Design a protein around this ligand. Structure first.
Ligand code: NA
Ligand code: NA
Length: 226
C-alpha cells in the first residue's frame, strides 16, 4: 500500500470513449461503468454513437473497455492503483489465428473523482467471411494475462479464445505494454485471471452491458516446449 493510493476508493465510476476502425469502417463508442477496485469486479454500459450497427463482433471491443479494477493478494503491489492521481496509458497488439490484427492505445486519467478512459482502435486484415466480420463469435473464454516488470512498465501476454457460434475456439495472442505516468513500486512477474461476460445487449449491439472479474496471483513456475 502506497501514500495517496486511497484515491482509488472501494467503489469507483468511469467514463469511456472509443474511436475505432475495423477493415477501414470507422465507428465510435461512448459508455460508463463502475466497480469495486479491490474486489476485482466491474460493469459497463456501452453505446454505439457512430458507424452502427457494427458490422463486426463486439468481442473485439470488450477487452478495450480498466486496469484499476484488479484484485491483488497482500504481497503483489498494484502498479495501476499506485499511478493515481496522474494515471497511466497502455498500448496493445492483438494477433488473431486467421491474420486479423488490432492495434489499441488507451489513456486513463482521473477528473473530479471519476476515471476517464480514451481508447483508439485500428483493426485490419480480417477475412470478410471470417467469424469476426460475420458476427459468429459468442464471447471470451476465461483467460490468464502473464505480466512481467521491465524498465518501470508492465508487459502482458494473453492466449485469448473467442467462442464460435458453430462450436470451437477462435484464438488470438494479445500483447500489451502498461505505462504509469510516474514511477511506482513494481511487482514481480505474476498472472491476472479474468472472465469477461456480455450480460445484456439490444438485438443490433448498439447498447451492450459487460461484467468482468479480474484476480492477480503468483505463478508456481515457464519457457517449457511441452
Ligand atoms: Na481490466
Ligand atoms: Na459473453
Amino acid at each position: 500500500v502506497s501514500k495517496g493510493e486511497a484515491v482509488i476508493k472501494e467503489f469507483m465510476r468511469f467514463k469511456v470513449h472509443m474511436e475505432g476502425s475495423m477493415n477501414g469502417h470507422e465507428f465510435e463508442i461512448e459508455g460508463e461503468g463502475e466497480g469495486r477496485p479491490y474486489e476485482g469486479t466491474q460493469t459497463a454500459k456501452l453505446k454505439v454513437t457512430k458507424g452502427g450497427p457494427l458490422p463486426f463482433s463486439w468481442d473485439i471491443l470488450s477487452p478495450q473497455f480498466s486496469r484499476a479494477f484488479i484484485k491483488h493478494p497482500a504481497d503483489i503491489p498494484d502498479y495501476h492503483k499506485q499511478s493515481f492521481p496522474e494515471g497511466f496509458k497502455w498500448e496493445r497488439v492483438m494477433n488473431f489465428e486467421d491474420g486479423g490484427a488490432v492495434t489499441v492505445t488507451q489513456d486513463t486519467s482521473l477528473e473530479d473523482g471519476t476515471l476517464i478512459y480514451e481508447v483508439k482502435l485500428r483493426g485490419t486484415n480480417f477475412p470478410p467471411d471470417g467469424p469476426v466480420m460475420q458476427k459468429k463469435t459468442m464471447g471470451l473464454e476465461a483467460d490468464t494475462e502473464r505480466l512481467y516488470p521491465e524498465d518501470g512498465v508492465l508487459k502482458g501476454d494473453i492466449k485469448m479464445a473467442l467462442r464460435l457460434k458453430d462450436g470451437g475456439r477462435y484464438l488470438a495472442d494479445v500483447r500489451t505494454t502498461y505505462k504509469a505516468k510516474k514511477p511506482v513500486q513494481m511487482p514481480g512477474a505474476y498472472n491476472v485471471d479474468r472472465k469477461l461476460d456480455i450480460t445484456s445487449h439490444n438485438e443490433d449491439y448498439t447498447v451492450v452491458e459487460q461484467y468482468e472479474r479480474s484476480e492477480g496471483r503468483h505463478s508456481t513456475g515457464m519457457d517449457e516446449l511441452y
